[model samples]
Each structure stands twice: as C-alpha cells, then as structure tokens.
Target: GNTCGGETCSAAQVCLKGKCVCNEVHCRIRCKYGLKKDENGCEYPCSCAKA
Candidate 1:
C-alpha cells in the first residue's frame, strides 16, 4: 500500500513510500490555526490558546 497500512501520518509527517516522513508542506497547508517548529525545525500543527 502507498500509505502506512491505512494508518494516518502524524501532524508533522506525511506518508511516503509507505512510511511516515517529515514534510514541511503538509504542515504549512494543513494547520488551521498556525504552525510550530521542533528543535530540528520540523513544522507541526499548533492551535491558538483559548485563554
């Protein structure tokens, strides 16, 4: 299968070659609120604080 056996990739990654890999574009587009970067500069989804 192209995906991880129908498993979903995490917010910071995408399914490629049947594996999950860090994909910046996915984070750039998918994040509804904003994006956050990890220590290695990998983008991840982030939500705005309600308070």
Candidate 2:
C-alpha cells in the first residue's frame, strides 16, 4: 500500500493510482533460502549477506 507513484513494475504488475511499489528482492535473501526455519518459521542472520 505504497503511494509514492510513478515506478515501473514487472510484467502484469502495474504502478497503480496513488500507489508505488517495487520488489525488495533483486536476488534471494539469506533470510529465506539460506537458513533452516524454526517451528514458527522465523529466523534471522547475524549479518545479512547473499551468496
């Protein structure tokens, strides 16, 4: 629900009225694919770095 406006999104993803959006992931996050999850499925790295 961002409202920054005039950003270009990917295929079929448009920057809508009064809302700007973009992707946070240029590559996969270490927070996602690099760690084993807990039972509640939350984890954090001491330092966030991608391979």
Q: Which stretches of candidate 2 lie over 4 Å from their true place?
A: 1-4, 20-51
> Each model's TM-score, in the order given?
0.37, 0.21
lDDT to native, each model = 0.57, 0.38
Task: Tell how far residue 3 is off in model 2, in angstroms.
Answer: 12
Question: What is the per-residue lDDT of model 2 for residues 13-38, given as tens digits with 9 covering 90 to 100?
Answer: 33556453332323345454364433
Model 2 residue 22 CA deviation in Å: 10
lDDT tens per residue, model 1, 5-45: 57666667767787767785453344444566655345655
Candidate 1 TM-score, true structure as reference:
0.37
Question: Against the true structure, what is every candidate's RMSD?
Answer: 7.1, 10.6
- Which candidate leads the pack in TM-score? 1
Residue 50 in candidate 2, Cα distance off native in Å = 20
